Structures are given as structure tokens and as C-alpha cells.
Amino acid sequence: GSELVQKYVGEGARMVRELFEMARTKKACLIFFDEIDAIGGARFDDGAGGDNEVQRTMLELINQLDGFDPRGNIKVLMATNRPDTLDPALMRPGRL
Amino acid sequence: KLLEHKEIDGRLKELREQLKELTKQYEKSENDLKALQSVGQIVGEVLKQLTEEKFIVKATNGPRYVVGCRRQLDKSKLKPGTRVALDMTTLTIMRYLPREVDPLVYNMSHEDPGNVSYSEIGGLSEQIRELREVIELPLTNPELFQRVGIIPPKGCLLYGPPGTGKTLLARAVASQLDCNFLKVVSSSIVDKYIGESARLIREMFNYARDHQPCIIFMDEIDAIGGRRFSEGTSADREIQRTLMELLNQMDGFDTLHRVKMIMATNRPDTLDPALLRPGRLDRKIHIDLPNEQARLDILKIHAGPITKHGEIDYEAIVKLSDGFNGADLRNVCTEAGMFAIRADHDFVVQEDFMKAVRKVADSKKLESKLDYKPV
Amino acid sequence: CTKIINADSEDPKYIINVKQFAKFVVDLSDQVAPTDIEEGMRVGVDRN
Amino acid sequence: RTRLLDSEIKIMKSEVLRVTHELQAMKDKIKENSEKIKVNKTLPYLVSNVIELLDVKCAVIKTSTRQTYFLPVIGLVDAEKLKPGDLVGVNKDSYLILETLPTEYDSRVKAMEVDERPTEQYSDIGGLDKQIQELVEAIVLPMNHKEKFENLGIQPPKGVLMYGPPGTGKTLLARACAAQTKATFLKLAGPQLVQMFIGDGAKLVRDAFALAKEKAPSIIFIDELDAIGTKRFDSEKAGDREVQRTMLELLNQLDGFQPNTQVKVIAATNRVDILDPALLRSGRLDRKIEFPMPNEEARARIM
Amino acid sequence: RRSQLKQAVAKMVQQCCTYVEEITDLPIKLRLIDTLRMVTEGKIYVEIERARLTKTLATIKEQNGDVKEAASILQELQVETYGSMEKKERVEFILEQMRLCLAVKDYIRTQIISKKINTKFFQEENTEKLKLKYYNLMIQLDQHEGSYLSICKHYRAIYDTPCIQAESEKWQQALKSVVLYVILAPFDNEQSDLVHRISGDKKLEEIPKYKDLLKLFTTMELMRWSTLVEDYGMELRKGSLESPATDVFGSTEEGEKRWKDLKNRVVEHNIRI
Ligand SMILES: Nc1ncnc2c1ncn2[C@@H]1O[C@H](COP(=O)(O)OP(=O)(O)OP(=O)(O)O)[C@@H](O)[C@H]1O
């Protein structure tokens, strides 16, 4: 989870595209996003936008996960101690 | 014989035209070689004048070098804040050239349009009366106000129902004074600094001073990214501070060219009582809900760019839906056009307008995203 | 290392973004096969 | 007669001298051409777009190195031929345009187009029929004859926003529309546009809009429009300035541009609250397609 | 129904005009007053109260230019800032208010509504020259109220129409009135640039007076006033032109004041050189 957060703006979002690309190249793979809360699993997206870089990383995961062709052969396992904190779009099924 | 010789001379003339084209190619080659010698100049902005001989400047990329002027560089026109050309090796001022894309500044400049029609939604009972009268007297004669000694009223507030006088008639005032207007939405004015918003407004006021006819319009002053921030722990009333700063800018420090900074906006939820005091807000004009007979007139103005069957009773369509919004009446006309599009009719029958009015009546019943109330 | 974005007819004049430097119109090196160089392929360009 | 023939012979001698002059003009041009070829090939060519065009005949170029240079001479290529905001080939050290270069677009923009095309039906969406019809008027009617709009004088709006709770199918209408009607559908997301380098995202939005201009039947779909269109940050000094620049680029194309209805854009957001008032503006994204949570009748059909 | 009343009122104004010629002042004014009360709410769409302004103009003639009647025209015309939908005649009506203020002879009184005149602009350059014909009246009003330099500023504007007319005396007078300003106007950077611009006109060259006026324009060393009186005896009564002579020594109020000014301006010329 820490690796996905990065110093440069949206550098982590680029990594998430790579994560799916690596997943697509292998045939049938399971991705375990343990501690989903670390991967910006919330979308307050307030005017301060302190989490703006992470929020972009979270949205990039959501779109790659589902929409305009989804995982295709990827099964996603996500584990959270606090389910309530998770952002609604990720909680929505199809993604999980 | 002689005619054949003339034909041979004509062929020679054609060869001469080809020689002229070859000479043009030689001229182009000479120009290209002359061009190659020039080595370009770093583009930079003069931070300040250290001395007449040397001006401190910063290159656009970021390294800053103190530099000296070249020949007749017109140091008077080299005043700080002017883009300059810097020699690639010498790093000295070469020429004064001002070119800035200024995309955010363009939003703060003359981006706002002016509506040419005198009565787009009609409803001009005080719009071309009270609103015109207060602005016109200073605009025609600031000196007459000076003889009275009263400061010309800086601005007036068009508190009114949303859309009917807010979506429309916002730029109609520009036609009434026959000049382009500046829209103070404030979205461009508040960018990355809460404090800079007042300073950017001062820059807009200076732009307004440039045209004496142009009148500042504070349309949608509350409107901002997200929602306007009232006093709060995360964000305080920066806009309210800007309003107090605006009052200082309006009178004294920034009043010239008989330009009226009218706060003609019903968008702000709260109106400052001190602003209401004669001077900052000498008079307030209230836009009113349409009289239905007025709505019929509005529908006719909206129907003006419309192709219709001609068997149309506009009063019946107006009676069928009391939209009470100029935009809603414009919507009736557009929806009637959509009904006309169905069945491929270029003309719009009265029934199509009435069907649109029924859809508009449903839209009148259900409304969303409106959180702006004057006072 | 640099990344190719396009190719052109006749002299290829492949234009490459280094990674932060610039779009460089670099011709293929003499000891290379033109077919082997491909559009949208990472490539190594000698600076000199 | 004979004198006219003698005059033609003298002109023919001048023409022989002119052939030598043409060879000399070619030789001078060849030397400039050889330098031009070497400079484009050289590493410091730094081909990049001209920020603006100036006259004393002058150009200002921002190289990919992000350094801006003003050239007193516009360059070897014709000043009229050069277009502001168009790729131009800067000199290795002179920083003077030598060649315009072939037009090229970001690889990401090319990837966005759905060459394969989607496989969905308008019928498959259930309980959102009224919204499906509204989308058809916004996109299909401009795609079809605009003559009916022209005769009336009404203009079809360009730019559609679909706002709904996450479960409601904003993407489902978009995927079905692309499958039912083939008009160069383009995928897009607020994160995809965001890029590390400042203004790189703005180029991506501009190139995508240019691709839409290139194809007469073109639809661009941007899911999660909120990510690019976040409320403009008021963070002072250091901030995500690049993302705001990308949002401004989309606004620049939408405002006072694309009057032709050939290109239309559909955008979707889980939350419309984050979106700036500017993106909707007055006509920039006038179309709104709210997706209600499924009604009891709709739920039975959806299941 | 109000529109029907307006149609009846439009008929009333035509009837009132016929009544004005048909009957003496006491009946016609009463009839005009009766319609006026009914249309107090009604706007002056055409001559609805413009006829009332004509009626007060008539009352001024009946009352032998009574100031109160002039004041009555002044207040109603002042009220009609935007009352008349038509623009050209409405501006002309504002001029009619101004002429009555000049008739008061306060001089300031004309200036008081001259501020309202200040609002009026661009009569010249209007299509059909109809506004230009009206423009001639507005500049004509300026005289004592305009400053000696200012009278020239208006006289040059008046000069264009007579120059088009090419009248032997009126076109010559139109250029002459602007030229005579120098003698009554104090030396200034503006005065010097203006005198050079007026000087050298071919039409001005024909006039003998222009040759006399050139003495001030050039340094000309010193011009004695006594010599000038012999030179300008023609100005007092040319007998051929003398059309703009009113601008200089016309009589006493606008003439003797000009006579003192000429002595002062040449005395100022003597000290400057
Ligand atoms: N009326 C419907 N008929 C069929 N499927 C539907 C319907 N409404 C929603 N869906 C389902 O919703 C999903 C479509 O993705 P959806 O548009 O909900 O994603 P999203 O990006 O979260 O949307 P939004 O941007 O509107 O929040 C699919 O699982 C689809 O089957």
C-alpha cells in the first residue's frame, strides 16, 4: 500500500496502470489489496485536496478494475479492518 | 516570316519568365543564409531596475542574471514587468517585446460577452429605468456629481429571482450602456491564494478603468469552486473579507473614468449592512417574477429565432405553463423545436409548443442545485 | 535510453522523447537495420 | 522578322546564363538544405510547439526542455506556413525553426479510441429509458442530419454530463451508445489525463480534442470527470497545478470553440458535487442526464 | 384597453393641433391641459407631451417670452430625458429647452441645462445630415457662454456646412469666425497650435482680414495698437463682408468686451516679444 503512494503527483497512479498491465500479461491472477484504506480507500476529496494525489490513484484503480473492459481474468481480494471507511465506488459490486 | 519571328520572341519571353523564377529561388536562398546567422534570444521578465546601466531580470526557465541594456533600448519602456530578449551568450537586454498568453488573465479581462438585444426577457420596467438612471448620470457627467460633492454611487444590486433576471438580463445591461462588460464570477479571481482575490479584483478594476463605458458587473459573486466558504474552522469567510476590501477599492483608492462597479448579483446569500449604506450601495433594484402577460412577450422574443406553422396562439401556450423563468420560456421554445424535430417538421405547430410547455411545467415543478438567496 | 513516438517516409527521421529532455529528430545509426527499429519502441541513442 | 529572331537568340543566351543562375541558386539552397538535414538529425534540434507568432517575421518557441526562446528571424520555413501552437523544429543552438516537421499526437490519445467497438444494446439498460432518449437527442441527433435543427435555428448542445449514484449505469448508457452507433468513441478518465510533468496532462486533453476534430463522427467519453475537474485547489505556492492546467485545457476547447456539432463529449461522475461550476458553465456542458436509483418496476426488469 | 385610450389620445393630439389654429389661446390651452392630465401615466410615445412642449412654446409667444412660461418648457423638457421614443427630434427638443434658458439671459441658466446638452453628442456624422443641420443650432447657441478659445472650437464645427454651401459671405464668415478668436483669446500652447492649423487655408487666404490676423500668429516683432486700429477699421464695418464682425466689435456687451480684449491680447503680444 505504501508503494502506491509516491512523492511525484500521480506517479503512484502510473504504477496502478502498470499493476493492471502486469496482471493482464499473466493469464488468470489474483491481486490482494490488503489494507485497502492505505490505497486512498475514501473519497472526501475536500477543497484542500490534500489527498488529491492519492484520490487520483484510487480512481485509476477503480476504472482499471471495472468499466470500459474490466479485469477480464483478474480476481481482486481486498481485506479491511474498517469496512465503513472504504469509498462507496470501490464498495459498489462489479468492482468487488 | 515576321509573324513567325514574333512567335520565336514569345518563346524567348517564356524562358525569361522561367529565369525570373530562378532569380526568386536565388533570393530565397540568400534570405535563408542570412537567417542562419541569428542565434535567438533567451525570453525573460525584468524583475527590477538595479541601475540605469543594469536591470535585474529572471529567465522564464528560472535562473536569474543581472543584465545590462544594449543600444537604444528605450529604458523608459524597459520598466520592470516587461518581457525582454536576452543575448544567448552575452546575457544582456536586446529588445523590449511584450507577448503573454495570459489564459487566467483573459478570464479576468474581456471574456464576459454583452447581450445585444435590449429586451431578451423583456421585464425592463426598472431595468432600462432605475438601473439605467443611476449608472447614466455619473457616466454622462461625473463632474455634475462632483458639483453636488456626492461621490458617484459605485454600484447597484439587482436582487431578483434566479434565472429570469440572473441567467438573462445579466449581459442585457451591457447593450443598455452600449459597451462590453467584465463579469466578476470570482472563480478566476480566487485561484490559489485567498488574499490574492482582492489584488486580482484590483487588476480587473484597472482593466475596467481602461474603458470608461465598460461597467464592472459582479455577476455570480458568491459562485466559486465547490461552494462559497462562510466563516468556518477549515475555511473562513475569505469572500466576506474580499467584499470589505472591495468596498475600500470602490471608493477612494480605485474610482476613476466614471466606471460603475455595480454589485448586480442575487447570488450572495448575505448582504453586508455597511455595504447597503448610501455610497457603496446607494440604490438596490429588485427584479420581479413575470406578470404572465410579460411572459407572453418573453415567449415572443424567444420565438423570434423560430420557424413556425403560423397557426400559433402564444397566449394559450403561456397560459398552459406558468414557468415564471426566462430560461424556462426559452426552454419551451427549444423543446418545441425538439417536438418539431420529431416527425421532421421544419415548422413548429402550436401543439408542439404546448407539448413542450407541459414538459416545461414538469421542469418548473422539480428544480435542483439552487442555493442562492438575496438577503 | 529514449522512447520512439513516430516514423516518417523516405529518411525515417524517427522523433524520440529522451525521458525529460526533448523531442529529438534522430536518424537511424549506420550499423542498424531500419526494420528492426520500430515506432513505439524503446531505443538507445548515442549523445555524440 | 530577322531582327526579332536575333532578339530571341540574345534572350536564349540570357536563358543559358539563367540555367547557370538556377544551378547557383540550387547550390546555395543545397548548402542550406544540407545544414537543415544535419540540424534536424542532430540531438539539439529539440523539436517543440511555438508558443506564439510575432512580427517586427518572429517566433517564440518553448522547447521540450521547457526553455522559451524568442527568435528575431522566424526561421527557414515560411512565416505564414507556421501556425501558433503547432510543432516546429528548433535550431540546435540558434533555436531558430528549420522545418515544421510532420504533425504527431500523444500515443495515449491513439490508445483511447475503441477500435474494437463495444458490444451492448440500448434494450439491455432497464428503467432508464427516458434518460436513454435524452442521450440520443444529445449525441445521435447531431450525428444524424442537423438540418431539422438548422431550419428551426436551434443548435444541438455539445457536451453531456451524466451524474448518478455509483450503482446506476452511467457507463452502461455510454457503453451501449458506443456499440449501437459507431462514431469514433474515445475512452477517458480524470486519472488518465493527470500526468507527472506540468502541462503534459493539458497536452493529452488537447490532443484528444484534436483527434475528435479529426473524425467527423466522434464521441469522447470521460468517466470520473471529477478527478480532472476537482474544485480548483486554493493551496498556496506548491500545489497540484498540473491537474488544474488539464481542467483549464478541457474548458478552453469547450468554451467558444467546437461550434460545429460533429464532435460531442459524454462525461460521467459518481459525485457531481466535486465538479467545478465552470465545467458546466452555461453551454460548456449544458446537457445533464441524472440517473435515478432503480424504481420497483425497474428493479424487476433489471434482475 | 390602455392602448385604445392611447389611440384616442393620438387622435386628440391631431385634434389639439387643429384646435390650436382653430381657436384662441384660452380654449386651446384648456383642451391641451385636459389631455395632459389623462396621459400623465402615458409616455410621450410620439408628441404625446411633446405637443404640450409646443403648447408651452406657444404660451411663451402668448406671454411675450414670460420667464415662467420658459421655465414651464424647461421643467417638462427636463422631465423628458427618455420620454420620446424617437431619438433625433428628442435631442432637438432638448435644444429647444436650452434656447429658452439662453432667452432667460442669465448665461449660467443655459449652462445649467448645457450640462444636459453635454449628455447629447454625435449630432455631427449622423446619416442624412439631418442631425448635422440640428448640430448647427447646438453650436450656434455657444457664444458668450463658450470661452474665447471655445467659441473657435465651435465655429470651426459650424464652418464645415457653409464651406459645403460655398456661400461667398457665409462660407467666408464661417472660416472668419474661427480665425477672429485669436485676437480675443489669450496666448497658450493650445492657442499657438490652433492658430497655425487655421492659418494657410486657401479659402482663408482669399480674405484680406486673414492677412491682418497673420501678424499675431508670427512673432512679427511688435505690432502697435494704434496701427492696428487703422488696419482693423474695416473690421468695424467692412461693407462687403463684416458677417463675423459681431464676433469681435459687434456693439457693447459682446463687442466692447471684445474691444478691450483686443487691446489686452496685443499688449500681451508686446510683452511676450
Ligand atoms: N438499468 C440497468 N440495467 C442494467 N444494468 C444496470 C442498470 N443500472 C446499472 N446497471 C449495472 O451497473 C453497472 C454499470 O456500471 P456503472 O455505470 O454503475 O458504473 P459507475 O462508473 O460507478 O457509474 P456512475 O459514473 O454513474 O457512478 C453494471 O454492473 C450494470 O449491469
From chain B residues 218-277, the ones with a CB under 8 A of any chain A CB are: 225-226, 229, 234-235
Query: Residue of the nearest CA to atom 20 in ligand 1?
Result: D166
User: Nearest CA to A33 among A77, A87, A83?
Assistant: A77
Distance of CA E46 to the CA centre of its chain: 26
For E206, other C-beta atoms within 10 Å of its C-beta total: 10
Per the structure block, which three cell numbers stand in for B307? 420557424
* Residue reference for cell 434656447: E99
Phi, psi torsion values for E39, nearest 5 degrees: -100, 25
Q: Which atom of ligand 1 is nearest to the CA of D162?
A: 26
Please state the atom number of ligand 1 nearest to the C-alpha of residue D301.
3
Instruction: Tell me if B160 is assigned to a ligand binding site.
Output: yes
Indicate the burial class of B121 (C-beta count within 10 angstroms; 0-12, 13-18, 19 or more).
Answer: buried
Residue ranges of the binding site of D: 164-171
The kind and range of the H/E element at B286 are strand B281-286
Query: In Å, what is the CA distance from D134 to each residue of A41, A61, B254, D128, D139?
Result: 34, 30, 49, 10, 9
* Alpha carbon distances (Å) from B21 to B17, D17, D18, D77, D78: 6, 14, 10, 19, 17
- Specify the amino acid at residue D254: L
Structural determination approach:
cryo-EM
* Residue B197 sits at the chain D interface (C-beta within 8 Å): no
B254 and B210 in contact (C-beta within 8 Å)? Answer: no
DSSP B153: P
D221 lines ligand 1 (CB under 6 A): no
Residue D270 Cβ inside 6 Å of ligand 1? The answer reads yes
Q: How far apart are CA B204 and CA B223, in angstroms?
A: 17
Q: Does A63 touch chain D (CB under 8 A)?
A: yes
* Distance (Å, whole) CA B65 – CA B57: 6
Type and span of the H or E element at D53:
strand D48-54
Q: Could you tell me the distance, in angstroms and rounded to a whole number, from the CA of residue D173 to the centre of ligand 1? A: 8
Query: How many Cα atoms are found within 13 Å in the side-chain-facing hemisphere of B331?
Result: 21
Residue where the block lists cell 458506443: D178
Q: Which helix (H) or strand (E) holds B83?
A: strand B83-87
Contact between B131 and B118 under an 8 Å Cβ cutoff? The reply is: no
Q: How far apart are CA D216 and CA D144, in angstroms?
A: 11
Amino acid, single-letter form, for residue D283:
G
C-beta atoms of A89 and D192 within 8 A: no
Torsion of the alpha carbons at D168, D171, D173 and D178, rounded to the nearest 10: -170
Cα(B157)–Cα(B131) distance, integer angstroms: 9
Q: E26: how many CB neighbours lie within 10 A of its CB?
A: 8
D1 close to B (CB below 8 A): yes
Contact C25, C15 (CB under 8 A): yes
Q: Which three cell numbers stand for residue E141?
A: 447657441
Q: How far apart are CA A91 and CA A58, in angstroms?
A: 12
Do chains C and D touch by CB distance (3+ pairs < 8 Å)? yes
From the CB of D272, is ligand 1 less than 6 Å away?
no
Question: What residues contact E145, with CB distance under 8 A and at least 6 apart?
Answer: E102, E107, E110, E111, E114
Q: Please report the atom of ligand 1 found closest to the CA of residue A92.
A: 22
> What is the number of alpha carbons within 13 Å of residue D66 lying toward its C-beta?
11
Are the C-beta atoms of B265 and B222 separated by less than 8 Å?
yes
Q: Give the full edge-to-edge strand order of the sheet including C23-25.
A: C23-25, C15-17, C2-6, C42-43
**DSSP tally for chain E: helices H, then strands E:** 16, 0
Pull the grid cell for residue D207.
490532443
Helices (H) and strands (E) in chain C, counts: 0, 4
Nearest-angstrom CA–CA distance, D9 and D15? 9
- CA of A92 from ligand 1 middle (Å) equals 10
* Count of CB pairs separated by less than 8 Å, A with D: 73
Burial of D71 by CB count in 10 Å (0-12 exposed, 13-18 middle, 19+ buried)? buried
> B275 to chain A nearest CA, in Å?
29
Strands C2-6 vs B216-217: parallel, antiparallel or unpaired: unpaired
Q: What is the resolution of this structure in A?
A: 3.0
Ligand 1 atom at shortest distance from the alpha carbon of A89: 22
Report the sign of the C-alpha dihedral through residues B63, B69, B73, B79, in that order: positive
Tell me the nearest-neighbour CA distance from D262 into chain C, angstroms: 28
Buried b (16+ CB within 10 A) or exposed e, D80-107: eebeeeebbbbbbebbbbbbbbeeebbe
Using the Cβ of D258 and the Cβ atoms of chain A, whether some distance falls under 8 Å is answered with no
B269: which 3 cell numbers?
446569500
- Which residues in chain B are closer than 8 Å to A52, comparing Cβ atoms? none
DSSP annotation of B287: -
Q: What is the DSSP letter of D75?
A: B
Alpha-carbon gap: E119 to the closest alpha carbon of chain B (Å) = 6
Selection from E191, E190, E253 nearest residue E217 by Cα = E191
Q: Is B58:B45 a contact under the CB 8 Å cutoff?
A: yes
**Is B303 exposed, middle or buried, given 0-12, 13-18 or 19+ CB atoms closer than 10 A?**
buried
In chain B, the residue whose alpha carbon lies closest to the alpha carbon of E119 is B140
Rounded CA-CA distance B258/B241 in Å is 25
Chain B 117-156, residues with CB within 8 Å of chain E CB atoms: 132, 140-141, 144
Chain E positions in Cβ-Cβ contact with residue B144 (cut-off 8 Å): 115
Dig out the grid coordinates for C32 from the structure: 542498424
Which DSSP symbol is given to D213?
H
Q: How far apart are CA B60 and CA D66, in angstroms?
A: 9
| Three cell numbers written together for B228 | 462559497
Q: Are strands C15-17 and C2-6 parallel, antiparallel or unpaired?
A: antiparallel
Question: Under a CB-based contact definition with an 8 Å cutoff, are residues B135 and B285 in contact?
Answer: no
CA of D166 to the centre of ligand 1 (A): 7
DSSP-derived secondary structure letter, D140: I
The cell for C16 is 524520440
Residues 6+ apart with CB under 8 A from A80: A35, A36, A37, A41, A86
Comparing CB atoms, the residue among A11, A55, A63 nearest residue D223 is A63
Conformation bin of residue D226: beta by default, left when phi > 0, alpha when psi is -120 to 50: alpha
Residues D150, D155, D159: CA angle, nearest 5 degrees? 145
What is the distance between the terminal CA atoms of chain B, rounded to a whole angstrom? 101
Q: CA of E29: how far to CAs of D302, E6, E34, E51, E60, in Å?
A: 84, 20, 9, 11, 12
From CA B159, how far away is CA B147, in angstroms rounded?
Answer: 31
D168 lines ligand 1 (CB under 6 A): yes
CB contact under 8 A, E119 and B144: no
* SS3 call for B5: helix
Is there a binding annotation on residue B166?
A: yes
The gap from C-alpha B53 to its chain's centroid, in whole angstroms, comes to 41
User: Residue D70 and residue B97: Cβ atoms within 8 Å?
Assistant: yes
Nearest to B137 by CA among B116, B118, B151: B151
Q: How far apart are CA D13 and CA B345, in angstroms?
A: 74
Containing H/E element for E79?
A: helix E67-79
CB contact (8 A) between residue B40 and residue D75: no
B2 touches D: beta carbon within 8 Å: yes
Length of chain A (residues): 96
Query: In whole angstroms, what is the distance from residue B132 CA to residue B124 CA?
Result: 10
Q: Which three cell numbers stand for residue E213?
A: 490676423
* Residue B179: HSE in the Cβ half-sphere, 13 Å Cα cutoff: 19
The three cell numbers of residue E199 are 492659418
Please, which residues have CB within 8 angstroms of residue B346's CB and are 6 or more apart in sequence? B307, B340, D148, D151, D152
Give dist(CA E215, CA E262) in Å, integer: 13
Atom of ligand 1 nearest to the CA of A94: 29
What's the gap in Å between E105 CA and the centre of ligand 1? 86
Please give the distance, rounded to the nearest whole angstrom, from the Cα atom of residue D174 to the centre of ligand 1: 10
SS3 A95: coil
For the stretch B22-32, what's the b/e string if a residue is b when 16 or more beta carbons lie within 10 angstroms of its beta carbon?
beebbeebeeb
Give residue for cell 490559489: B192
Angle at B81 between CA B76 and CA B84, to 5 degrees: 75
D230 touches chain A (CB under 8 A): yes
Give the integer Cα–Cα distance in Å for B82 and B45: 6
Q: Would you list the DSSP string of E176-238?
A: HHHHTHHHHS---HHHHHHHHHHTT-HHHHHSHHHHHHHHHHS--S---HHHHHHHTHHHH--
Looking at ligand 1, which residue's alpha carbon is closest to its atom 26? D170
Q: What angle do CA D154, D156, D158 make, to 5 degrees?
A: 140
Cα D114–chain centre separation: 17
